[PDB]
Amino acid sequence: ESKQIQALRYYSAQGYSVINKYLRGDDYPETQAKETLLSRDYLSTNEPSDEEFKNAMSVYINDIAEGLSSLPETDHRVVYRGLKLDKPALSDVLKEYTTIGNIIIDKAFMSTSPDKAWINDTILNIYLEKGHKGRILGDVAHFKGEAEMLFPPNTKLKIESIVNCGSQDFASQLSKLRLSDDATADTNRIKRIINMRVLN
């Protein structure tokens, strides 16, 4: 098993919790980032310089991305994601994702499912064209039995349409999605569907 796949396994288990905030330019767990770099030997101490830290994070991210890229391609042409976009703090994110024809860049690794969306205020219905960079994790995923298609950083997507709750159009579109039916599933929580397309 390549060391890159092993880095992707770690991403799936725990590294995601640090890396994606880092990549977004958000506040992230700095101490944990450094502890990860030390434990996986990208650095010799947990107290590096800022350039040593940045360079090591780069290699770590690139290992995860390369592990991902090396996984087999599949024939999926759509995937799904539930998001919470109705938080006050995400108001500009909400506006971006609900601007028809907007092109958005996801700076982080982007997790999606080929099989179902977990209900949230927003359901993304994400169309894919052949040759896209998403890969099914399969047994690389830490927890098994939930299909996941992961995309590397900087996925570009186009907002094609937005379907708000409370019409037959919405009801029909929603009925043609497979949703999570877990213990807390409630479709009445859904405010919108956003139909998107990854631009390769």
UniProtKB/Swiss-Prot annotation:
Residue span, TR mART core domain: 1-186
Entry superkingdom: Bacteria
Stretches of the chain forming a coiled coil according to its record: none
Compartment(s) of residence: Secreted
Active site: 81, 111, 148
Secretion signal, residue range per the UniProt entry: none
Family: Belongs to the SpvB family.
Role summary: Mono-ADP-ribosylates eukaryotic muscle and non-muscle actin on 'Arg-177'. ADP-ribosylation prevents the polymerization of G-actin to F-actin, causing actin filament depolymerization, destruction of the cytoskeleton and cytotoxicity. Does not possess NAD(+)-glycohydrolase activity, unlike most mART enzymes.
Other facts: In Salmonella spp. the spv gene cluster is encoded on a highly transmissible plasmid.
The name this protein goes by in its record: Mono(ADP-ribosyl)transferase SpvB
Taxonomic classification: Bacteria, Pseudomonadati, Pseudomonadota, Gammaproteobacteria, Enterobacterales
Full-sequence portion shown in this chain: 391 to 590 of 591
